[PDB]
Amino acid sequence: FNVAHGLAWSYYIGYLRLILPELQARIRTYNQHYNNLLRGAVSQRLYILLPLDCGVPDNLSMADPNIRFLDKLPQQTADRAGIKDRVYSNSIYELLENGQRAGTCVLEYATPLQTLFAMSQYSQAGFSREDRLEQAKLFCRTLEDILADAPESQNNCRLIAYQEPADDSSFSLSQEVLRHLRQEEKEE
Amino acid sequence: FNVAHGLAWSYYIGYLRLILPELQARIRTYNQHYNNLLRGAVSQRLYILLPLDCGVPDNLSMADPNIRFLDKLPQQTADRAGIKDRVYSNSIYELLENGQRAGTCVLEYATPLQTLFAMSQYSQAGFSREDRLEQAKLFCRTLEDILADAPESQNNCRLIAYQEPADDSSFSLSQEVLRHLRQEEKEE
Ligand SMILES: Nc1nc2c(ncn2[C@@H]2O[C@@H]3COP(=O)(O)O[C@H]4[C@@H](O)[C@H](n5cnc6c(=O)[nH]c(N)nc65)O[C@@H]4COP(=O)(O)O[C@H]3[C@H]2O)c(=O)[nH]1
Ligand SMILES: [Mg+2]
Ligand SMILES: [Mg+2]
C-alpha cells in the first residue's frame, strides 16, 4: 500500500491544521512569561525533523546530546471528539554548539515517519521494509505540497529532511537544525 | 488512494498499542480515588464509536444529549519523540436513559473516521466523497483484524460500528452504546 500519502494528510488535518494557526501566540506567551529577558529567543516556527531513514528515537537528546530539552510550550486545548479539552504537546529545545547555547526553538520529529518504520515489521502492514525509504520520501513530499496550499502555513513551520551517509557518521543533527535557524535569521 | 488501511495502522501503532495496556490501571485509579463511593461503575473498556457515515461531531453531547461528560480519565504521559511527557487524553461519559444514569464508561469517536470525512473535501486528498463509505468500512475492518492479533488487546476496548437509516432518524446513539455495556455486563 501507499501509506506516506495518507499519513501526511492525517498529519496535517489532525495536527498542523489545528495547531499552526494558534502556534505563534503560544510561543509569544512563553517568551513573555518565562523571561521577556535573557535569551528569550524562542524561534517563531515549528521545526519538524524529517529523518528519511525513518529512524525516530523517543528522546531527542539521544539522537544528539547537543539538543537539550528546555521547557514545554504552553498547552493547547481543543474539544477533539470524542475527547473534551484534548491536550496538544510541543517541546522546546535549545541547541548547543561547542558548549554554547546557539539557539532555542520548538522542535520535534514527525511521528508518521516513526509509525512508517514500525509498520514494516508487521505482516499485515503489508509494505516491505525495503519500501521504507520511498515511503519516507513520499511523505516529506506530500507534506510540502500540502503545506504549499495551506492557508494556515503562513510560514509557521519549517520541514527538515535529511539522510545520513552510509559510509561515515560525521553528521550532527544539532548542526542541521542550527543551519535552518541561522538561515532564517538572515531570511528574517 | 486506499487510506482506511493506513489510518487504522497509524491509529493502532500510535494510540491503541500505547494506551490500552496502561488503560485499565488508569480506570481503577479514577474509580478508587473518586470513590469508592456511589456509582463508581466506570466500565473496564475503551469504547470507540465507529460512525460508518463518517460524521464525527467534536462534542459528543451534541450527537446525543443523553451522552453526558463526567470527568477526564487521569492523564497518561509518554516521551513520544520529539515530544517529552506527551499527554494522552481520554474522556469519561455517563449515558442517560429516561433521565436515569444507565452507565459510565470511557468513550470516544475514532478520529481517523473524522479525518477521512475531511479528506474528501480536498482536491489533492485524492479520494472522492463517494468513496467515504467503503473507506469507512475498510477502516473498522482493518482495526478488527489488527486488534484480533493485538497482544495488547486483552479485551481492553470494544469497537462500535453503526450506520443510521436513510429514511428515519429514530436512532439513539446512547442506546447503541448502552447495548454493548449491558451485553458485556452479561460477561460480568
Ligand atoms: N506533538 C504532537 N503531535 C500530535 C499531537 N496530536 C497529534 N499529533 C500528530 O497528529 C497525528 C495524527 O493525529 P490524529 O489525527 O489526532 O490521530 C491520532 C489519534 O487518532 C490517535 N490519538 C493519538 N493520540 C491521542 C490522544 O492523546 N488522545 C486520543 N483520544 N487519541 C489519540 O492517534 C492517532 C494517530 O496518532 P499519532 O500517531 O500520534 O499521530 C498524530 C501525531 O502525529 C499532539 O498532541 N502533539
Ligand atoms: Mg486531532
Ligand atoms: Mg503517538
UniProtKB/Swiss-Prot annotation, chains A, B:
Chain sites annotated for binding 2',3'-cUAMP: 15, 86, 111
Chain's role: Facilitator of innate immune signaling that acts as a sensor of cytosolic DNA from bacteria and viruses and promotes the production of type I interferon (IFN-alpha and IFN-beta). Innate immune response is triggered in response to non-CpG double-stranded DNA from viruses and bacteria delivered to the cytoplasm. Acts by binding cyclic dinucleotides: recognizes and binds cyclic di-GMP (c-di-GMP), a second messenger produced by bacteria, cyclic UMP-AMP (2',3'-cUAMP), and cyclic GMP-AMP (cGAMP), a messenger produced by CGAS in response to DNA virus in the cytosol. (Microbial infection) Antiviral activity is antagonized by oncoproteins, such as papillomavirus (HPV) protein E7 and adenovirus early E1A protein. Such oncoproteins prevent the ability to sense cytosolic DNA.
Effect of residue 86 to A: Abolished cGAMP-binding. Abolished ability to induce autophagy
Record comment regarding domains: In absence of cGAMP, the transmembrane and cytoplasmic regions interact to form an integrated, domain-swapped dimeric assembly. In absence of cyclic nucleotide (c-di-GMP or cGAMP), the protein is autoinhibited by an intramolecular interaction between the cyclic dinucleotide-binding domain (CBD) and the C-terminal tail (CTT). Following cGAMP-binding, the cyclic dinucleotide-binding domain (CBD) is closed, leading to a 180 degrees rotation of the CBD domain relative to the transmembrane domain. The pLxIS motif constitutes an IRF3-binding motif: following phosphorylation by TBK1, the phosphorylated pLxIS motif of STING1 recruits IRF3. IRF3 is then phosphorylated and activated by TBK1 to induce type-I interferons and other cytokines.
Modifications after synthesis and translation: Phosphorylation by TBK1 leads to activation and production of IFN-beta. The phosphorylated pLxIS motif constitutes an IRF3-binding motif, leading to recruitment of the transcription factor IRF3 to induce type-I interferons and other cytokines. The phosphorylated pLxIS motif facilitates SENP2 recruitment during late phase of viral infection. Phosphorylated on tyrosine residues upon MHC-II aggregation. Ubiquitinated.
Organism: Homo sapiens (Human)
Quaternary structure and interacting proteins, as annotated: Homotetramer; in presence of cyclic nucleotide (c-di-GMP or cGAMP), forms tetramers and higher-order oligomers through side-by-side packing. Interacts (when phosphorylated) with IRF3; following activation and phosphorylation on the pLxIS motif by TBK1, recruits IRF3. Interacts with RIGI, MAVS and SSR2. Interacts with RNF5 and TRIM56. Interacts with TBK1; when homodimer, leading to subsequent production of IFN-beta. (Microbial infection) Interacts with human papillomavirus (HPV) protein E7.
Stretches in topological domain Cytoplasmic: 1-188
Outcome when changing residue 115 to A: Strong decrease in c-di-GMP-binding
Illness the protein is tied to: STING-associated vasculopathy, infantile-onset: An autoinflammatory disease characterized by early-onset systemic inflammation and cutaneous vasculopathy, resulting in severe skin lesions. Violaceous, scaling lesions of fingers, toes, nose, cheeks and ears progress to acral necrosis in most of the patients. Some patients have severe interstitial lung disease.
Impact upon substituting residue 3 to M: In SAVI; constitutively active mutant that promotes the production of type I interferon in absence of cGAMP ligand
Residue span relative to the full protein: 153 to 340 of 379
Reported effect, residue 112 to A: Strong decrease in c-di-GMP-binding
Effect of residue 6 to S/V: Partially constitutively active mutant that promotes the production of type I interferon in absence of cGAMP ligand
Annotated region described as Cyclic dinucleotide-binding domain (CBD), given as residue ranges: 1-188
In-chain residues carrying the UniProt-annotated modification Phosphothreonine: 77
Tissues in which the UniProt entry reports expression: Ubiquitously expressed. Expressed in skin endothelial cells, alveolar type 2 pneumocytes, bronchial epithelium and alveolar macrophages.
PTM annotation (Phosphoserine): residues: 89
Binding-site residues for 3',3'-c-di-GMP, renumbered to this chain: 10, 15, 86-89, 111
Disulfide bond entries: none
Chain positions recorded as 2',3'-cGAMP binding sites: 10, 15, 86, 111
Note: The cGAS-STING signaling pathway drives sterile inflammation leading to type I interferon immunopathology in severe COVID-19 disease caused by SARS-CoV-2 virus infection. Tissue damages in the lung and skin lesions are caused by activation of the cGAS-STING signaling leading to aberrant inflammation. Endothelial cell damage is also caused by activation of the cGAS-STING pathway: SARS-CoV-2 infection triggers mitochondrial DNA release into the cytosol.
Protein name according to UniProt: Stimulator of interferon genes protein
Glycyl lysine isopeptide (Lys-Gly) (interchain with G-Cter in ubiquitin) crosslink location in chain: 84
Protein family: Belongs to the STING family.
Glycyl lysine isopeptide (Lys-Gly) (interchain with G-Cter in SUMO) cross-link, chain position(s): 186
Cellular compartments annotated: Endoplasmic reticulum membrane; Cytoplasm, Perinuclear region; Endoplasmic reticulum-Golgi intermediate compartment membrane; Golgi apparatus membrane
